[PDB]
């Protein structure tokens, strides 16, 4: 598959299912590229897949796409380690990739089933930006006959908080939209904080929409629980030390890529340290942040 056809396939996959995650669509596109590959060697296939991953990351700058590409690369490497013959290797790769897609298509249901029991009846939940996983968790909580109130931040500049508020109003849930600046004003009302994640870094922290770090800090100040819901394919092998240690390709969008109305090209993601996170609700279960690194240490090496 050429670069243009890869981009078209990825965009069509995203468009056909709006609820499909970007990382899942990228992994499916990578599997299609593997199926359509013509090479007869492992190294050539690896190079072609790396080029495809670079193309997809150029299309979409989210950490989820990069983590999905890295996961697929590790998957083909694990398949190649066991089997020396390339034909059997490719056949097993195709079968296990189909199984992998089928399994990761059900991550959100497992996350919701595991997480909906943590929402106490008659509680207030504070949320940042839009997140399909959080929406599914709240759907499951509502279906379990639980009444709760929701505060959602506006999440400037794309105002995805209003979209999340409309989605929650569709489910007949009392939802109130607050300003980002008002987060510290409203934390005293929230019983718990639930946010998604665009990627889970090695130490267990997360890389999420800008404004999540200050929400986590305010929650830690008032000793409120901070819960993250994220699928396993969002695990990345990154170890930022501060906000500037996050790679620049993730902070600034694809189309985006002094001292006077500069604005310094407002970042889109920030890093939240694992010390500000109480629990993670992945498709692998309910984990402490320290468990996340384990899933990577066993994945490689």
């Amino acid at each position: 598959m050429d670069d243009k056809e890869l981009i078209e396939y990825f965009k069509s996959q995203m468009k056909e299912d709006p609820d499909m995650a970007s990382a899942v669509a990228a992994i499916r596109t990578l599997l299609e590229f593997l199926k359509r590959d013509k090479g007869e060697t492992i190294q050539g296939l690896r190079a072609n897949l790396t080029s495809a991953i670079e193309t997809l990351c150029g299309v979409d700058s989210s950490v989820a796409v990069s983590s999905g590409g890295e996961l697929f690369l590790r998957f083909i490497s694990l398949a190649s380690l066991e089997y020396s013959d390339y034909s059997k290797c490719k056949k097993i790769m195709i079968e296990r990739g189909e199984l992998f897609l089928r399994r990761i298509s059900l991550s959100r249901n497992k996350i919701a089933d595991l997480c909906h029991t943590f929402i106490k009846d008659g509680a207030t939940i504070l949320t940042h930006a839009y997140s399909r996983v959080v929406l599914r968790v709240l759907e499951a909580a509502v279906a379990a006959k639980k009444r709760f109130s929701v505060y959602v931040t506006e999440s400037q500049p794309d105002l995805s908080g209003k979209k999340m508020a409309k989605a929650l109003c569709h489910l007949n849930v009392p939802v109130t939209v607050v300003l980002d600046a008002a987060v510290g004003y409203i934390m005293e009302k929230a019983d718990l904080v639930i946010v998604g994640a665009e990627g889970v870094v090695e130490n267990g922290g997360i890389i999420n929409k800008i404004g999540t770090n200050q929400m986590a800090v305010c929650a830690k100040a008032q000793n409120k629980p901070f819960y993250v819901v994220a699928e396993s394919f969002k695990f990345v092998r990154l170890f930022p030390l501060n906000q500037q240690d996050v790679p620049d390709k993730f902070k600034y969008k694809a189309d985006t890529l002094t001292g006077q109305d500069l604005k310094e090209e407002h970042p889109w993601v920030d890093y939240t340290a694992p010390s500000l996170i109480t629990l993670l609700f992945t498709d692998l279960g309910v984990l402490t942040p320290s468990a996340v690194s384990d899933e990577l240490i066993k994945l490689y090496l």
């Binding site: 005293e188 008032q222 000793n223 409120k224």
Partner: protein, 261 residues
């Protein structure tokens, strides 16, 4: 009196005031005139430093209490009980959670009063405080003394409640009359404290009695601490007859009360 029981801060301040009043008596005054003046001064001290101060503190604290509040009180404090009773009488509706501790169990006193006034009241022991603080909206404590650095010297366990309330994100208010403010400073409960009777720590659990004849064990010690010191960082507000002040305003108030004398 010190031999009978170590003097409280209020007693020390009253003694200092009386000594200052006696010293300032002119040598030309007749004996009966001086005695009548001293008795009148003591009566004025009681009326202004305790009664009118309590009324003013109750009026000030009435503003903080709101409808639907759940106020956690600890032990027995006449000022806190008066504040709650006068707030209930004036029309405020609220619940009170009484936290008590061994061996004095003074909180029961408060409980009784809160039922005579008709205020709904829950009751529990101090170790269960962490269980009840999610419901609590305000903690209202009485103070035996306020030290010059802002520390609150109160019944043992008050600082514990302040710490757990801070951990649960609950405001802590302290009610104290300015006549109990002290110029001393304490950084801990070890330097200055009172050791009550150790035998009061014995309890009747079942048919047996543990700690009976505890002096027969050479390595066994019973520690019946009386007071404890809450650092000013754990106190959000102090209500005095001068109004609502920060915990760091103790040294200035003393100064205001000393320039007059």
């Amino acid at each position: 009196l010190t031999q009978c029981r170590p003097l409280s801060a209020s007693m020390h301040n009253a003694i200092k005031f009386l000594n200052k009043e006696i010293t300032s008596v002119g040598s030309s005054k007749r004996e009966e005139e001086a005695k009548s003046e001293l008795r009148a001064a003591i009566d004025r001290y009681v009326q202004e430093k305790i009664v009118l101060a309590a009324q003013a503190i109750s009026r000030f604290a009435y503003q903080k209490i709101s409808n639907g509040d759940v106020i956690l009180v600890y032990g027995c404090s006449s000022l806190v009980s008066r504040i709650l009773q006068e707030a209930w009488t004036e029309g405020r509706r609220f619940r009170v959670v009484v936290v008590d501790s061994r061996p004095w169990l003074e909180g029961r006193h408060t409980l009784r009063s809160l039922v005579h006034a008709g205020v709904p009241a829950s009751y529990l022991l101090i170790p269960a405080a962490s269980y009840v603080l999610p419901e609590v909206s305000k903690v209202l404590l009485g103070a035996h003394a306020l030290l010059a650095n802002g520390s609150v010297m109160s019944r043992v366990g008050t600082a514990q409640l302040a710490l757990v309330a801070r951990a649960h994100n609950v405001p802590v208010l302290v009610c104290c009359e300015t006549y109990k403010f002290c110029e001393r400073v304490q950084t801990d409960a070890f330097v200055s404290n009172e050791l009550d009777d150790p035998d009061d720590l014995q309890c009747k659990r079942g048919e047996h009695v543990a700690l009976a004849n505890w002096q027969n064990h050479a390595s066994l010690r019973l520690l019946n601490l009386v007071y404890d010191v809450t650092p000013p960082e754990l106190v959000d507000l102090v209500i005095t007859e001068l109004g609502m002040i920060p915990c760091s305003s103790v040294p200035v108030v003393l100064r205001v009360k000393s320039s007059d004398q």
